[PDB]
Amino acid sequence: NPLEAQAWALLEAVYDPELGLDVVNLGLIYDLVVEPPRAYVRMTLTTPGCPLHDSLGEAVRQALSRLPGVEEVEVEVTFEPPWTLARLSEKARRLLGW
Amino acid sequence: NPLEAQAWALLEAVYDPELGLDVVNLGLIYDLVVEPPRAYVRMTLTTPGCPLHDSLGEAVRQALSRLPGVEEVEVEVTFEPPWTLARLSEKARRLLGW
């Protein structure tokens, strides 16, 4: 499903403002399912508590809505499990310096 | 602290759109501290997951910002503990019919 690869590439352009890294390499994407006309993503945030405006979740929704055949995007934001820097990818660790 | 009573009265005018009851009688307010120039409230939502726009949390922030002497309102939205109808007040149960 090349659509899935397309989805990841799109998400890799969405950045967390506090850490300056994309949501994929930060390890914020917990699940991703793309089955036209629907796209589903389960993700978390880098800090606890629901913000008044989930700008990151909105950016992810907008990114996935660009997928061909996708007319509805469900973005589920959860804290289960809770995120920590241990979820950073190998690439992210290179970009950081680690 | 009459300011505290003022705060509760203000919150009793903020309604959850899905249930048609105010946040206080629904049992959504977990903690409330009013110490000028700051107001703090910890609350939850009636359904899981962080919404893209936390309109309820915003309404609570706007309501408390009307308190005299209060210049900053911190609204913490959590799911710990998770909410259920068991947290409804006695009054809410009368209003419902129970």
Ligand SMILES: [Mg+2]
């Ligand atoms: Mg972890």
Ligand SMILES: [Mg+2]
């Ligand atoms: Mg309960």
